[PDB]
Amino acid sequence: LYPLVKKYLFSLDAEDAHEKVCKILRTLSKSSFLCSLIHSQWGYKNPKLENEILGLNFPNPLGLAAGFDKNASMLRALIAFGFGYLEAGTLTNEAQVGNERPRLFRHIEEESLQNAMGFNNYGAVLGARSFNRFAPYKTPIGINLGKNKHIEQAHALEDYKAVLNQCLNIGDYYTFNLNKAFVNELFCMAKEMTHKPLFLKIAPDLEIDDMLEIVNSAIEAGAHGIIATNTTIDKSLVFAPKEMGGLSGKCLTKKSREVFKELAKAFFNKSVLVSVGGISDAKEAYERIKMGASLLQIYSAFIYNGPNLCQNILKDLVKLLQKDGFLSVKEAIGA
Ligand SMILES: Cc1cc2nc3c(=O)[nH]c(=O)nc-3n(C[C@H](O)[C@H](O)[C@H](O)COP(=O)(O)O)c2cc1C
């Protein structure tokens, strides 16, 4: 039972626990049989959840958010737990340690996390090797690209070019983890290097007008989709000072929802919208889809719910579609 695994893991430092889980996931990824075994217990397939988006086949709309598999080394095991797709990364051009530890904290009663990890990854060269070790994969795989911490904001566009150039032969889409005057050149540069879908991922703490400016520049430069949101630093909760990083999980549900309503209001008919932040159950996921989200992502609820996360949410989602009159998730994406 996962409750016993959680009691053990939650008694450990949160990053230590994550590394013990990554070690097991990397080991399981070596065995396609054990992955097919995992999928038979925790997978869930339903044609009502299938969609084709930007040339790509998503068998369900529920993806694993970036930051869980930063180095593209356990994708096969994670797919076996039922996600419709995975986003690996954030990957940087060169390896990078990230911020000083401790940098991950749990707020267990609130089913939330707080992190200031800062792009710890082994670099794109190794990340492409690790992707290739077990490729091809049974779902789409996104590659989340970032800028190395030291790369000066002058030759910073040239850093997104180097990491994207190193990842050109892996993955099915790219996410850029993000000034309105720079987003146009980023996606213009990127459009000339690959034909694969391009997404902008935004924080949830932008002023709405400032948010509409940034996003609109991205679309007009050729961005194909917007991912909202990353973690928040607005909720000044007493038990989570700001020096411990951004909040994820259920403490993010409300602001992520609010940000996404505004995003959809301005951009639903002009871009693919992906909702992230504090999705833990099928009702919330179904609300995001009805608000305008073609796809979803989860990080924190995977910690708190465990391997049954996907089939729980997806089974319930099917019943919501059927208790609403939709023959598939494609009809539900409407206002
Ligand atoms: C420990 C941790 C590491 C993360 N690392 C990244 C990352 O490397 N790149 C990224 O774009 N988002 C990263 N995220 C953000 C998640 O992808 C997601 O945007 C956020 O956690 C909100 O979703 P959630 O409420 O389902 O957790 C990270 C989140 C956590 C908790």
UniProtKB/Swiss-Prot annotation:
Bilayer-crossing regions: none
Cofactor: FMN
Annotated localization: Cell membrane
Gene3D superfamilies linked: Aldolase class I
InterPro entries linked: Aldolase_TIM, DHO_dehydrogenase, Dihydroorotate_DH_1_2, Dihydroorotate_DH_2, Dihydroorotate_DH_cat, Dihydroorotate_DH_CS
Top enzyme category: oxidoreductase
The EC number(s) this enzyme carries: 1.3.5.2
A GO term from the CC aspect: cytoplasm
GO molecular function: dihydroorotate dehydrogenase (quinone) activity
Pfam family, one: DHO_dh
Residues where FMN binds: A66, G67, F68, D69, K70, T90, N144, N177, K201, T229, G249, G278, Y299, S300
Cofactor detail note: Binds 1 FMN per subunit.
Residue sites binding substrate per the record: K70, N115, A116, M117, G118, F119, N177, N230, T231
Bilayer disposition of the protein: Peripheral membrane protein
Pathway: Pyrimidine metabolism; UMP biosynthesis via de novo pathway; orotate from (S)-dihydroorotate (quinone route): step 1/1
Domain of life of the source: Bacteria
Signal peptide: none
Keywords linked to the UniProt accession: Cell membrane, Flavoprotein, FMN, Membrane, Oxidoreductase, Pyrimidine biosynthesis
Catalysed reaction, written as an equation: (S)-dihydroorotate + a quinone = orotate + a quinol
Main localization, broad class: membrane
Quaternary structure (record): Monomer.
Physiological role: Catalyzes the conversion of dihydroorotate to orotate with quinone as electron acceptor.
Protein name as annotated: Dihydroorotate dehydrogenase (quinone)
Species: Helicobacter pylori (strain G27)
Annotated gene: pyrD
